[PDB]
Write a protein that binds this ligand. Structure first.
Ligand SMILES: CC[C@H](c1ccc(C(=O)O)c(Oc2cccc(Cl)c2)c1OC)N1CCC[C@H](n2cc(C)c(=O)[nH]c2=O)C1
Ligand SMILES: CC[C@H](c1ccc(C(=O)O)c(Oc2cccc(Cl)c2)c1OC)N1CCC[C@H](n2cc(C)c(=O)[nH]c2=O)C1
Lengths: 196, 194
């Protein structure tokens, strides 16, 4: 089994990359694609609260992302791993670190301690970081100043997380055309998987 | 202003005591009594999720109690404290420490780290612990329920041993009129010294 997470800002080509990699991996592996809350009833109820939030306190929002994360992990991810599946997960702990910790200003270490409570040691086996520049990402989103700066800070946050901790992290150049980003991601995954 | 929390297992007469103490304190102080979620919409929605939980993972449950704690703190407690009020809160961080941390077995220090993210330094000024023996508590209320009850009491003892200065323990084995009186006097002594 393998728990593989995908990280990156918006405009990193993440949706295309996961879908195309899934289509190639299913030839050799029992693979699933997922994202939080991913159909888990409690997680879906949490998601409704977050999306209905009127200027929700950023720490309450972080705790709700973390509670949705745990429900998705325990009720969907772990049973799939037990079946021997390759789980392709769109966003996990690192999104809360980059978005809640860095971009929203809570503090990466405070958000880390919260999410370590949530995942209880279950870190991804492999994390694909779709490393897009802010300018390329901006163009992919189009195809506001506060939004542009928020997108910039998300990337700055990811840069901080990957520069500090790196072992499961595999950075893929997402400034390339998407066919190349798919090929580099697929090859990175196959290299990991074929080493058991 | 003062933020005073009330803690204890079931059977400690905690609800009755806080209600009576609050009714007496309103005569001399600008005071409110509340509990989580306490009407805050997001907290109420989180409460519904917890109550609807079918064998809910204990850490998800702890995170939801912590999210309800923050909403109630931010929208009710902090605005009242800024208005200079005495805030009486029935159950706070120590309830998550005793129940989720100790009794459910996640670990007090793990649950403390989670709750410190939720309260962001807003610990109670004073915590009233209604110290009921497991035997009196049992009587005031099967093997599993009695074992969980004893575990909560044991958890509260460990917490109070580690943070003696924040707690004031009231003998909850006495008749409730005495528990009310000792709790009231403990609070007044604290309020008249600040
Ligand atoms: C509004 C922010 C946005 C977003 C977009 C779509 C959904 C939606 O599902 O319709 C969404 O709701 C979610 C998603 C995941 C988990 C929950 Cl509980 C609610 C959402 O966050 C509220 N952004 C998009 C970029 C990534 C952001 N994000 C994601 C995760 C997983 C995290 O931990 N932190 C974070 O800020 C959310
Ligand atoms: C079933 C557990 C029970 C309890 C009783 C009544 C309510 C109810 O409101 O009807 C309740 O729901 C709540 C209460 C507070 C906050 C939320 Cl989000 C939900 C509840 O916990 C699910 N016990 C009773 C003993 C104390 C327990 N407790 C309380 C708090 C505040 C905590 O942090 N941890 C904990 O285990 C809950």
């Amino acid at each position: 089994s393998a728990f593989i997470t995908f990280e990156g800002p918006e405009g990193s080509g993440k949706t295309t990359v996961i879908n195309e990699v899934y289509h190639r991996l299913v030839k050799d592996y029992d693979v699933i694609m997922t994202r939080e809350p991913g159909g888990v009833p409690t997680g879906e109820e949490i998601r409704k609260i977050v999306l209905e939030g009127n200027d929700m306190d950023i720490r309450t929002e972080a705790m709700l992302f973390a509670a949705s994360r745990r429900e998705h992990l325990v009720l969907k991810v772990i049973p799939a791993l037990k079946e021997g599946k390759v789980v392709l997960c769109d966003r996990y702990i690192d999104s809360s670190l980059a978005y809640q910790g860095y971009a929203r200003g809570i503090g990466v270490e405070e958000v880390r301690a919260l999410n370590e409570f949530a995942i209880n040691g279950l870190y991804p086996d492999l994390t694909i970081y779709l490393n897009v520049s802010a300018e390329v990402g901006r163009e992919r989103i189009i195809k506001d100043q506060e939004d542009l700066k928020f997108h910039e800070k998300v990337i700055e946050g990811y840069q901080e997380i990957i520069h500090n901790e790196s072992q499961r992290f595999k950075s893929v150049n997402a400034d390339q055309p998407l066919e190349n980003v798919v090929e580099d991601t697929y090859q990175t995954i196959i290299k990991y998987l074929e080493k058991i």
